[PDB]
Amino acid sequence: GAMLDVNFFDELRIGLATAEDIRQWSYGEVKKPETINYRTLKPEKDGLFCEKIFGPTRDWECYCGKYKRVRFKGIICERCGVEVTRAKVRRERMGHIELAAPVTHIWYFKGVPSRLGYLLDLAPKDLEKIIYFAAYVITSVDEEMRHNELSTLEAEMAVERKAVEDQRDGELEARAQKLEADLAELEAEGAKADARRKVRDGGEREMRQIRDRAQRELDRLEDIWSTFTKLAPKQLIVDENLYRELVDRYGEYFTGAMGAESIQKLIENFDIDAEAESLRDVIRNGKGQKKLRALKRLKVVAAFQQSGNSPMGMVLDAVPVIPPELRPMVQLDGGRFATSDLNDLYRRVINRNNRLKRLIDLGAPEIIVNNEKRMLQESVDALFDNGRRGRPVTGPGNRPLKSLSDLLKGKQGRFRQNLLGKRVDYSGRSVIVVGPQLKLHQCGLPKLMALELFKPFVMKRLVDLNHAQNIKSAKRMVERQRPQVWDVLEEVIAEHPVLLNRAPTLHRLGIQAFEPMLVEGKAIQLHPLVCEAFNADFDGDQMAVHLPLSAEAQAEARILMLSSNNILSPASGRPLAMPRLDMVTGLYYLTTEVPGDTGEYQPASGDHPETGVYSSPAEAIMAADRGVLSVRAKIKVRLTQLRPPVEIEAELFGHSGWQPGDAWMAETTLGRVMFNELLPLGYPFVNKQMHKKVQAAIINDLAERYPMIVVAQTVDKLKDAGFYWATRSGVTVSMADVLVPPRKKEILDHYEERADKVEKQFQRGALNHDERNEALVEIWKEATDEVGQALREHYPDDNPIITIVDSGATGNFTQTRTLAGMKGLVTNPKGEFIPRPVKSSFREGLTVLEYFINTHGARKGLADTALRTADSGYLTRRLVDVSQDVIVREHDCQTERGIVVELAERAPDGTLIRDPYIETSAYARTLGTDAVDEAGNVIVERGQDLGDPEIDALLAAGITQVKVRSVLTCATSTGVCATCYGRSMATGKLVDIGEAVGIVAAQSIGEPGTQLTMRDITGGLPRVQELFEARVPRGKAPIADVTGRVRLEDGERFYKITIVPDDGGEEVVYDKISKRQRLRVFKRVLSDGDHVEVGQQLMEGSADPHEVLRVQGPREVQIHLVREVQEVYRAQGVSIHDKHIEVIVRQMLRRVTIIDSGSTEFLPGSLIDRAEFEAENRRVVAEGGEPAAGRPVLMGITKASLATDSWLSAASFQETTRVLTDAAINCRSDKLNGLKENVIIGKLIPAGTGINRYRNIAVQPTEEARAAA
DNA sequence: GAGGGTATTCGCCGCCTACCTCTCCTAGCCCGC
DNA sequence: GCGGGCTATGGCGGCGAATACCCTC
RNA sequence: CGGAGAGGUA
Ligand SMILES: [Mg+2]
Ligand SMILES: [Zn+2]
Ligand SMILES: [Zn+2]
């Protein structure tokens, strides 16, 4: 269509190649197994590197040397025949090898299921035999002629049997004569009875051999007759001698072959329409396993029938050769060439082909020719796919060779190593250190990495400033680092953003744009507030740097990816540039009020006026800096620049506001005034100790009420204040600080008494081993709890350890107990607790045995961590693949469908208790209906963001359930609409019209995978994997299918649960329920003669998703899946808004399984898209309707991803060979429309700034401004 | 012995990302100089 | 006689398809 | 700079 390519691509088609196509591609033939000569270091002729086939090896030159200049352009050499052109042509031209005998393609023969077996209706073993010269196949038979001659041939063979039996009977008459002769021979004298019986033994044993000769020789003819008369095509006869007898006796009436040519002949004499009709008949009728087999047979046959693609492409007559420059051969140090894997396989094929050609041409016995044809078949099979059948062809050192198939498959294959990832210029890498003087939009770049990243700009500016007359001098001056290159560089790098990236890039914020400022050293200086977003630390971490060049890239960096614009987590909406650790400690210390502090406010004592009332924060600062006042002391100041609180302002100023400049009296500490002076001017006074939660709330309110620049400035000021006041807080560690509980020994002795009593009871046989272990474990768990409580009580409130823990800076009190009080129980390598337990804290010093038994759990955790980091990436990749085509396309579909959120179910006694999990179920949603309470007016109008004010008003009105718009019910044909999706968590406003929400959902779900521990019912990452894969859970618990009472029965290893419906139509029953599983408690535990709902889960465990869909429909399975995934993630304290899971689930319920084909062409049991199914049914019903029938189906993410309409997106995900071989048979065309496909073909992705409405915007100066010029 | 219904076993597919340093790629034997 | 080139029984889970064992006609 | 193996950092 477009030869090389050149853009304006419209479709990419794939299909089988016939011998004609393969011979048209080739520019020549390879018929000599010679690669390159050593003396002249030139390719040979008619080899794998010939310059007369693949192209010249030197630009505008000939192997002849006749023409070696551009003037001789386009002329084919008259001496050597090599065309004169550029050397790059060797990357394009291909050659072919003309096989002496037909060869089958291994993909369509060995790949399970065998696509030749279904096509020809032959078992895989029959193909294995016929193709590898071990059996004979009847390619043809003559029926009418042989039927006519059957009557005569019957009599002919009857006469021939007459000859056999009559010769036998005459020879037996001779045997009888010899028998009488022997009788007389031993009767002429006195012989022995054993002698007579011996002559009879010999003679009559050879007469029994006469009878057995009749038997065997005539059964030979009977077998010949039976085989010949009933023989039909596609019959395999072993014992070549039998076939030789058949052909010799009946040369005509049939034709038998052996090898790939036999299969080629069979395919040639094979009509497709008749077979398709026969299979359709067997499908419409018959039933049974025959119908199931006919379904697959018809799949393949209709695939080969619908298109103009003959099935004769499976048998090869020519073999294409890849261009040489894509399979080059290099030389090790010294000049010794090491062969590539492809070259060796090509050489083997060529050798075998030539030797077989010689053997056939010179004439030879059939055995030798057949053996050589088999050895050529094997070599050609190994070329395409080495190791599929038989032992892999191994090279030096016993390692299998890399075939042509290996180039396309695996993590090191073409796709996932070269098309989905690249090596890019204008990038570097170095270690990262903390720069506390930077700003959120700034980074520090060494003054030796910038000089290399920004080289061309520096050269341009040097030439412009007349520092270098030309480009070469500027280049060399840059390479020599003259003192002025730095002066020009500082100007060059100004206002040019830089992209920094840390691996692994779990989520979106792993790449952010900053502004470069040159620093001293060789490390990168990273602002402390982006570490959580990058998940970076300063113990040896490294990062990469990228530089966008073009104007669009710079605009994207400056607006989309700038760090100061990305403060909130896209997954949940919580801030990520919040202070942490040292900043939290400093602010927490600053905004504290310690009673009885220096300079504290004192009421009037009756002799002197009040002490501690100041007339301005300036005077308070003066007093503090004079040592008379403490920053953490309660004072009464007179504030005129801080806006008063809500209550104080309401009761003091009222009116409209405080109108900056007014004065009011505050009773607070100096530190809190200092802190509130950091917040925006209009923010009401905050008078509280700044726990991490309080700071988080302040930052979130700022984000949701103010512009983002205000938030950035506020966080920077808080950073400065915290880093200043952490140094003065006085937090250090010494063994004097690590206090020990005062009465640890008493508690340990008290519980050791109980342990001893349990041990003595065990000794007296009162309990077994497990009971003793359980009792000891409970005793020691209680002991550890008491020790921890005592330790918590003992510590003062200003201890550095307790201050750091309770400040929210980092850590938890379990570590404090381990350090000071006691470590307690430790786990065996199995996972069970050691009943000892460990009894010394790390302050005292564990003994040798305690340390050794601690090492077990110490190592098991690291091993599990490695396993989990391995497990999570696969799930993330699968999620990204399944839902990569979900993009916001419309502003509003104006539908009315919606879902209902629990939204604070009412209390029994009467009260509105808020549902704990409401932030991830109601916020950032738009109402699909109006909210009316107690016949009142609408509280919230349809189409409202439903934020904090809205939810608070709804709760105040007294309504528990509301209907909201969701992606599960969007009515857009392709993609979701903005209103159904709702608010964008990162931006805080309605999502844009080019938002790729599928990838955001995938990264949000997969990023907190390592945190989610991998801990017989699955309860972690395996549980998530089986939920998203829609597999049978494990502890599958039956679910009712019709409401009714149950006659519960009790038995060992089985429980009979019968569904007695209220209607009484029929009773379902399950008797295989093992006694190990419990009975679920619904409404009291499940009991005999108890009515149950339709979807109630009788037993305990996990329900299978495929049955709830059958019983309760799609909505119920959707809510079930969302609830299960949310439960799994909440168990580990991770918050993910339900819209991401809703996107993922929506991508899993998108098809319908077909039942009745009707006038429609859908085959029974196939998975068909719902939109296409409905469209086809509606089209058909117009004209004498015979609509097809379908049912909802649930698919896993892997199947849903491999059932794509693009054969290029599925081949880059998994199972490249199977996808390619099926697509080639179905002759699928790829309409390139998607993120992955456009990335692969190097075209703008259809999302974000690549949509038509954005990429095709027009700009011009205004008329007024144009005139003002 | 073929049919239809169960079990049973074997083969294939999958198993995170980025970066740094260091050592080695046949053996036999037959022909040629 | 030595060098160079040519040839010749420590993964594991899921899943499906190719095939053991038993009642029926 | 193509392959195989060994060790290591986040
Ligand atoms: Mg680190
Ligand atoms: Zn020439
Ligand atoms: Zn919609």
CSV table of C-alpha atoms and ligand atoms in Angstrom, one decimal, chain A residues 62-67 76-82, ligand 2:
chain,number,residue,atom,x,y,z
A,62,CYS,CA,31.2,-2.7,-6.9
A,63,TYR,CA,32.8,-6.0,-5.9
A,64,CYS,CA,34.3,-5.8,-9.4
A,65,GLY,CA,35.8,-2.4,-8.8
A,66,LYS,CA,34.7,-1.3,-12.2
A,67,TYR,CA,32.6,1.6,-10.9
A,76,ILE,CA,24.1,-2.5,-12.9
A,77,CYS,CA,27.7,-3.7,-13.1
A,78,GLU,CA,28.3,-5.5,-16.4
A,79,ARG,CA,31.1,-7.7,-14.9
A,80,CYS,CA,29.9,-8.7,-11.4
A,81,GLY,CA,26.2,-7.7,-11.8
A,82,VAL,CA,26.0,-5.8,-8.5
E,2,ZN,ZN,30.8,-4.6,-11.0
